């Protein structure tokens, strides 16, 4: 509140030439300058020259009042100390009016009245800090706040007292002068900030008396402009995260730095990922503030993040989609939104959900980052179906889903990623076809590190009604069969390979009668990888063996041409072992059932003992 | 979860289903590897003994293979007698294959039952049986039981002697029975008898395989029983000088190599002279190569110091040989002799050394073959050793390296750059001299390269950053130009930026991090790169300080702290449960706290002039005060700074012992940071405050010639400057800190000269060791406390298993686990803490030494409080030298 931030920052380092740059600002902190220019020790020559220059530059109109205050403080060295000691002794013993007799004119004329007023204020502050919760008795020196603050600064600079107690008294009486205390010593700013941050609880600063303390801390951080990030970190690490969020928002609105990444998201990212203590702290804080609408910091944070989000909306409006330079920031913001609305999240609105649906349905530049962003947007729209209330949103989202299903092949061919979004789309389609919803939950909680719950098999059920509309077994099976095989697997990359959807398709049913004999895809997959042993290869081979002795779902028995062209001597060790396991499983299945309804299922096409003698 | 697996394996083993039984048996080792718990292993081994007692003779082989595979999990078996009985109950059958399988199983169990007389009697009886596979199994079991069990050795030595000398067994049976004599090192009489037997076998059975196996047995006995190693060396030299065969000569060469590898101090001058005389009379190349390899292995130990002129002549003659391996061995011997020995004339040999290195450079420059790359690496590490052990010839090798850098087809320049980077870590004048040539090579290398352009560019950038000190001239723009329009491999530029941040170059690091921020294929790596960029920017802005400046220094400190806060926020935004970042967060937070303490110190030093004398003088005369000299309000700020520095040093010492996986460089950097913090604390305690408190002069040597980095040398020089400026101004002026604050601020600025050095452990975290510490208390699945009578007792039964994701014996080895346990009251009794004493008397600091990867101790506690308590345990692993190494498992149980 006009605490001379620049003048204070200049005087904190050295007062050599900054005395001439501030003419009217040298009115509140003039007491410290007068005390340093009158009671100087004259240690060094440069220090003496600086003190002389400061005394020469302090020849203002209020120099007489400053000299009178300095003389009153010097004359109150022994008498005021004894008076305060006697008052403290009397208060300790007892614990075991015409504007207060012209209090405005008495404290400015005689030093004894000012000393008595300071002693009474200190006693009241001690009584309120011992055991009390109140902020009254502040309109005593409202008309003479300047003289009262000057007298308090003179008493603090002349008489020994506690800095934390004085800061607490200033925060409880009038914060407008609290920052003035920072202009008295200009050395205990960090200590005062830590004391103010440690003088509050966790569930406060929202609808209690801690709002005044939070405002005072914000004003002090704005007047300092140096330890603001340190104060925000201390708050986020100890208590009162709302003050830290407000300080971060103020620093982001004042300074134009952090252009590559918004500092608000940078600070809000560490709330549902680690540090479970601060995690549940922020959780209960946002839970308590969600119902309360008359609070400034959280709504300002939502507004700034919303405008930072919509600054990228004209780009996808006039162009096809996002750009390469803004494809990672959008994904980070989307993941932050997901983490914020993971469990016990806030209630969204339409003016934000519209832009969310517009950005989540953009056109990436066919970059693995863009593929990850598309997958994250798909999981976001699948875990939350709060978009069906309006027709235009649902029609645009289904149009974009059809576009993604069409261009999945292009996105997988250009971008050399292992698991694209099309694999997840086909997997959730097969899951909806198999009439279960727990697999969708496992999918959405396995694609990203958030063990959250959405609804007990009631939220995604609506999507099922859409699944039977257009995305029926006529196109999803084609897209699952027309996927390219993965080369040189690793069993370590995060994602769902086509092996999963192929296994799900072979397990559910294959009654299409026009999309059988997928042995070519199986061979092209098991051709040559040799690095891992995927845990799904054996169940895939098992369900493929079971997909031969099944009624009317007749596939090819993997004729001996592939074995004789593979096991002839890149057809590595793992491929040969998998082929041998498949052959042995087929030989075992030829003897297990032996009964295939005796209806046109009489062509097993077994081996004639001419291939088994060749394979070692 | 392991109970379900054991149950399903039992259900699979219940029915016959030979295939399913074999499947379960071969899957048992995976269950052993997954759960190393002793009770589950004991139950599984009991079930294996059960299925071994009755079987179709094929499950027995699978159980034998499982036992041979899982050998380390064999000592953690509770019921051993029943297991051994069930195993031995099948040796009385008439099936020879079953008896052979049982004998092999017993031999596989020779580490847990070395005194069972029934097994010894069975092996003794079945050793001379009328069979072919049972005899081999009995021989295997006899060797296993003769390794240990001295009684079995003394009982089987005579039988082995008669069976070998009976001349009624084939040559293969004797060749298999001879290696049994290796385990006769239990007594001197056994060693003498085995030596006489082997001598008689050599003198009576002259044959290639016979002599080879007998000499192998004899040398293994001599190496395991170091009583007659000189006689072994003499016999090997005699056989090298007399026996004309080629196989026996190579056997003796490998024998001498093994002896020098294990026991090199038993060699004498006569043995080395005889070996040199034998090598000088060898017309072949492979034999001379092996003898020179043995000589090079010997010269790397104290043998070359005890030998001190035939070895010198041999090394000088084989240094310029036609083949490359012999020349590499010769120059290695010469370099080892130069480094170890310090004779007078040997100085001239130094010449023959350096030029000899050229003989290994012009022959393996553009060969592109492993046989040449091996000798190249040998010569390069020998040159590194010669440069690090003798700085007198540091330039005479770097000039040859620079001249040879132009004679490689982009194949050996990576190794030359590695050698240059390893050599330049000691003396910076080499880098100052070769920076120009390195930049010339970096400019002329960006023409065309496809095979290994990535690693070549990485090595060039690394050696340039090591040679350079500022990287602010045109060279940085040239490197940026060479890396921009060329192939933009993300890993290459990432490694270049990592090396730049490691060496201290922060401008190039910031540029590369900004270039990489726009190309990230994920979200966590994006935050990681953003944090690295913010840290590099704060480091670069930290270097923007001027000597004797205090106006802009506060602004630079503030902006560096702001950038550090942004970076640590973006970094902790990337901390995930999967692969969590614990060292980086703590390191950055402690650096931020140290810089905040420095900012508070400079702020207090500046505010000392803001009328501090007359502030506290109103209550007491600070002038000529014997109680508190120059008593002012600055004393509280000085005490706060001192306690902050003490807490920072304590947290540094905690972080040192909390890693347990950091390299030597990272530990040295942490130690240097803590030393600087403690030095600033000592300066604020002894100089600014009363000098009569400590008055301890630092009259001791420091900064020895052992630092392996320029950062360490600069830190040590700054430490010495601070000590020499604080030891003199102690009793000069009054304690009002008139001139003391000036030198204090100068030292603070000097400490901020070197920005930082992100060591190797900051990235690529390897050697991931972890103690599971899975105690076995009463069954408590929920969070409800165990119902105890509160008066009898409460047992713990704690046990932990160590798990190493990487190579265990890489940097440190686990030797002891100092398990600690404490108790406290959960509910508040009278205050916010547990109680007046918190019931933390029950510590019971036990020191268990796990021989294998398993340990188990017993803990108790006595409490008479009807409330709820909390029990916590800590691992506190101890290494070989002995350090607390405070680990953070934090296993806390209520009751």
PDB file of N, CA, C and O in Angstrom, chain B residues 726-759:
ATOM      1  N   UNK B 726      41.536 -14.783   7.672  1.00  0.00           N
ATOM      2  CA  UNK B 726      40.864 -14.797   8.967  1.00  0.00           C
ATOM      3  C   UNK B 726      41.824 -15.053  10.127  1.00  0.00           C
ATOM      4  O   UNK B 726      41.520 -14.660  11.264  1.00  0.00           O
ATOM      5  N   UNK B 727      42.975 -15.685   9.879  1.00  0.00           N
ATOM      6  CA  UNK B 727      43.913 -15.971  10.957  1.00  0.00           C
ATOM      7  C   UNK B 727      44.666 -14.733  11.428  1.00  0.00           C
ATOM      8  O   UNK B 727      45.161 -14.722  12.561  1.00  0.00           O
ATOM      9  N   UNK B 728      44.742 -13.689  10.605  1.00  0.00           N
ATOM     10  CA  UNK B 728      45.498 -12.489  10.941  1.00  0.00           C
ATOM     11  C   UNK B 728      44.638 -11.383  11.534  1.00  0.00           C
ATOM     12  O   UNK B 728      45.092 -10.670  12.434  1.00  0.00           O
ATOM     13  N   UNK B 729      43.402 -11.221  11.059  1.00  0.00           N
ATOM     14  CA  UNK B 729      42.504 -10.184  11.545  1.00  0.00           C
ATOM     15  C   UNK B 729      41.715 -10.612  12.779  1.00  0.00           C
ATOM     16  O   UNK B 729      40.668 -10.021  13.069  1.00  0.00           O
ATOM     17  N   UNK B 730      42.192 -11.620  13.511  1.00  0.00           N
ATOM     18  CA  UNK B 730      41.455 -12.102  14.675  1.00  0.00           C
ATOM     19  C   UNK B 730      41.559 -11.124  15.841  1.00  0.00           C
ATOM     20  O   UNK B 730      40.545 -10.754  16.446  1.00  0.00           O
ATOM     21  N   UNK B 731      42.774 -10.695  16.172  1.00  0.00           N
ATOM     22  CA  UNK B 731      43.027  -9.811  17.303  1.00  0.00           C
ATOM     23  C   UNK B 731      43.610  -8.480  16.841  1.00  0.00           C
ATOM     24  O   UNK B 731      44.538  -7.943  17.449  1.00  0.00           O
ATOM     25  N   UNK B 732      43.070  -7.931  15.754  1.00  0.00           N
ATOM     26  CA  UNK B 732      43.551  -6.671  15.199  1.00  0.00           C
ATOM     27  C   UNK B 732      42.672  -5.492  15.600  1.00  0.00           C
ATOM     28  O   UNK B 732      43.164  -4.506  16.159  1.00  0.00           O
ATOM     29  N   UNK B 733      41.374  -5.573  15.327  1.00  0.00           N
ATOM     30  CA  UNK B 733      40.449  -4.477  15.565  1.00  0.00           C
ATOM     31  C   UNK B 733      39.435  -4.861  16.640  1.00  0.00           C
ATOM     32  O   UNK B 733      39.393  -5.995  17.122  1.00  0.00           O
ATOM     33  N   UNK B 734      38.614  -3.884  17.014  1.00  0.00           N
ATOM     34  CA  UNK B 734      37.562  -4.109  17.988  1.00  0.00           C
ATOM     35  C   UNK B 734      36.458  -4.979  17.381  1.00  0.00           C
ATOM     36  O   UNK B 734      36.260  -4.985  16.162  1.00  0.00           O
ATOM     37  N   UNK B 735      35.730  -5.740  18.212  1.00  0.00           N
ATOM     38  CA  UNK B 735      34.751  -6.697  17.670  1.00  0.00           C
ATOM     39  C   UNK B 735      33.483  -6.070  17.107  1.00  0.00           C
ATOM     40  O   UNK B 735      32.501  -6.783  16.875  1.00  0.00           O
ATOM     41  N   UNK B 736      33.472  -4.756  16.881  1.00  0.00           N
ATOM     42  CA  UNK B 736      32.298  -4.092  16.320  1.00  0.00           C
ATOM     43  C   UNK B 736      32.196  -4.430  14.835  1.00  0.00           C
ATOM     44  O   UNK B 736      31.268  -3.989  14.147  1.00  0.00           O
ATOM     45  N   UNK B 737      33.149  -5.221  14.336  1.00  0.00           N
ATOM     46  CA  UNK B 737      33.190  -5.662  12.942  1.00  0.00           C
ATOM     47  C   UNK B 737      33.313  -4.468  11.992  1.00  0.00           C
ATOM     48  O   UNK B 737      32.455  -4.216  11.144  1.00  0.00           O
ATOM     49  N   UNK B 738      34.409  -3.728  12.158  1.00  0.00           N
ATOM     50  CA  UNK B 738      34.698  -2.602  11.276  1.00  0.00           C
ATOM     51  C   UNK B 738      35.309  -3.082   9.964  1.00  0.00           C
ATOM     52  O   UNK B 738      34.794  -2.786   8.880  1.00  0.00           O
ATOM     53  N   UNK B 739      36.411  -3.827  10.045  1.00  0.00           N
ATOM     54  CA  UNK B 739      37.050  -4.404   8.870  1.00  0.00           C
ATOM     55  C   UNK B 739      36.773  -5.892   8.710  1.00  0.00           C
ATOM     56  O   UNK B 739      37.115  -6.459   7.667  1.00  0.00           O
ATOM     57  N   UNK B 740      36.169  -6.536   9.712  1.00  0.00           N
ATOM     58  CA  UNK B 740      35.875  -7.960   9.605  1.00  0.00           C
ATOM     59  C   UNK B 740      34.753  -8.219   8.607  1.00  0.00           C
ATOM     60  O   UNK B 740      34.790  -9.206   7.862  1.00  0.00           O
ATOM     61  N   UNK B 741      33.746  -7.344   8.577  1.00  0.00           N
ATOM     62  CA  UNK B 741      32.662  -7.508   7.615  1.00  0.00           C
ATOM     63  C   UNK B 741      33.158  -7.361   6.183  1.00  0.00           C
ATOM     64  O   UNK B 741      32.617  -7.996   5.272  1.00  0.00           O
ATOM     65  N   UNK B 742      34.207  -6.562   5.969  1.00  0.00           N
ATOM     66  CA  UNK B 742      34.748  -6.393   4.624  1.00  0.00           C
ATOM     67  C   UNK B 742      35.338  -7.698   4.100  1.00  0.00           C
ATOM     68  O   UNK B 742      35.003  -8.147   2.998  1.00  0.00           O
ATOM     69  N   UNK B 743      36.220  -8.326   4.884  1.00  0.00           N
ATOM     70  CA  UNK B 743      36.799  -9.593   4.454  1.00  0.00           C
ATOM     71  C   UNK B 743      35.758 -10.706   4.435  1.00  0.00           C
ATOM     72  O   UNK B 743      35.849 -11.620   3.608  1.00  0.00           O
ATOM     73  N   UNK B 744      34.754 -10.637   5.314  1.00  0.00           N
ATOM     74  CA  UNK B 744      33.666 -11.610   5.265  1.00  0.00           C
ATOM     75  C   UNK B 744      32.906 -11.514   3.948  1.00  0.00           C
ATOM     76  O   UNK B 744      32.616 -12.531   3.305  1.00  0.00           O
ATOM     77  N   UNK B 745      32.580 -10.290   3.525  1.00  0.00           N
ATOM     78  CA  UNK B 745      31.895 -10.099   2.252  1.00  0.00           C
ATOM     79  C   UNK B 745      32.781 -10.495   1.079  1.00  0.00           C
ATOM     80  O   UNK B 745      32.287 -11.048   0.090  1.00  0.00           O
ATOM     81  N   UNK B 746      34.085 -10.223   1.170  1.00  0.00           N
ATOM     82  CA  UNK B 746      35.002 -10.647   0.117  1.00  0.00           C
ATOM     83  C   UNK B 746      35.032 -12.166  -0.002  1.00  0.00           C
ATOM     84  O   UNK B 746      35.040 -12.709  -1.112  1.00  0.00           O
ATOM     85  N   UNK B 747      35.034 -12.869   1.132  1.00  0.00           N
ATOM     86  CA  UNK B 747      35.005 -14.328   1.101  1.00  0.00           C
ATOM     87  C   UNK B 747      33.681 -14.844   0.550  1.00  0.00           C
ATOM     88  O   UNK B 747      33.655 -15.835  -0.190  1.00  0.00           O
ATOM     89  N   UNK B 748      32.574 -14.189   0.906  1.00  0.00           N
ATOM     90  CA  UNK B 748      31.271 -14.583   0.372  1.00  0.00           C
ATOM     91  C   UNK B 748      31.249 -14.427  -1.144  1.00  0.00           C
ATOM     92  O   UNK B 748      30.744 -15.296  -1.865  1.00  0.00           O
ATOM     93  N   UNK B 749      31.803 -13.323  -1.650  1.00  0.00           N
ATOM     94  CA  UNK B 749      31.846 -13.106  -3.092  1.00  0.00           C
ATOM     95  C   UNK B 749      32.766 -14.121  -3.762  1.00  0.00           C
ATOM     96  O   UNK B 749      32.460 -14.637  -4.844  1.00  0.00           O
ATOM     97  N   UNK B 750      33.901 -14.430  -3.128  1.00  0.00           N
ATOM     98  CA  UNK B 750      34.827 -15.404  -3.696  1.00  0.00           C
ATOM     99  C   UNK B 750      34.217 -16.798  -3.749  1.00  0.00           C
ATOM    100  O   UNK B 750      34.509 -17.565  -4.673  1.00  0.00           O
ATOM    101  N   UNK B 751      33.378 -17.148  -2.771  1.00  0.00           N
ATOM    102  CA  UNK B 751      32.703 -18.441  -2.815  1.00  0.00           C
ATOM    103  C   UNK B 751      31.686 -18.504  -3.946  1.00  0.00           C
ATOM    104  O   UNK B 751      31.417 -19.588  -4.475  1.00  0.00           O
ATOM    105  N   UNK B 752      31.116 -17.364  -4.328  1.00  0.00           N
ATOM    106  CA  UNK B 752      30.159 -17.294  -5.422  1.00  0.00           C
ATOM    107  C   UNK B 752      30.826 -17.107  -6.779  1.00  0.00           C
ATOM    108  O   UNK B 752      30.127 -16.900  -7.776  1.00  0.00           O
ATOM    109  N   UNK B 753      32.158 -17.170  -6.839  1.00  0.00           N
ATOM    110  CA  UNK B 753      32.850 -17.042  -8.117  1.00  0.00           C
ATOM    111  C   UNK B 753      32.572 -18.247  -9.007  1.00  0.00           C
ATOM    112  O   UNK B 753      32.051 -18.109 -10.120  1.00  0.00           O
ATOM    113  N   UNK B 754      32.917 -19.441  -8.533  1.00  0.00           N
ATOM    114  CA  UNK B 754      32.574 -20.675  -9.234  1.00  0.00           C
ATOM    115  C   UNK B 754      31.070 -20.893  -9.100  1.00  0.00           C
ATOM    116  O   UNK B 754      30.551 -20.985  -7.977  1.00  0.00           O
ATOM    117  N   UNK B 755      30.326 -20.937 -10.208  1.00  0.00           N
ATOM    118  CA  UNK B 755      28.863 -21.046 -10.112  1.00  0.00           C
ATOM    119  C   UNK B 755      28.394 -22.312  -9.410  1.00  0.00           C
ATOM    120  O   UNK B 755      27.738 -22.237  -8.366  1.00  0.00           O
ATOM    121  N   UNK B 756      28.744 -23.471  -9.963  1.00  0.00           N
ATOM    122  CA  UNK B 756      28.336 -24.772  -9.441  1.00  0.00           C
ATOM    123  C   UNK B 756      28.969 -25.839 -10.324  1.00  0.00           C
ATOM    124  O   UNK B 756      29.606 -25.537 -11.337  1.00  0.00           O
ATOM    125  N   UNK B 757      28.785 -27.098  -9.924  1.00  0.00           N
ATOM    126  CA  UNK B 757      29.273 -28.229 -10.712  1.00  0.00           C
ATOM    127  C   UNK B 757      28.314 -29.396 -10.484  1.00  0.00           C
ATOM    128  O   UNK B 757      28.455 -30.134  -9.505  1.00  0.00           O
ATOM    129  N   UNK B 758      27.347 -29.550 -11.385  1.00  0.00           N
ATOM    130  CA  UNK B 758      26.414 -30.672 -11.321  1.00  0.00           C
ATOM    131  C   UNK B 758      27.164 -31.958 -11.641  1.00  0.00           C
ATOM    132  O   UNK B 758      27.548 -32.192 -12.790  1.00  0.00           O
ATOM    133  N   UNK B 759      27.370 -32.796 -10.628  1.00  0.00           N
ATOM    134  CA  UNK B 759      28.215 -33.973 -10.769  1.00  0.00           C
ATOM    135  C   UNK B 759      27.461 -35.083 -11.500  1.00  0.00           C
ATOM    136  O   UNK B 759      26.363 -34.888 -12.030  1.00  0.00           O
TER     137      UNK B 759
END
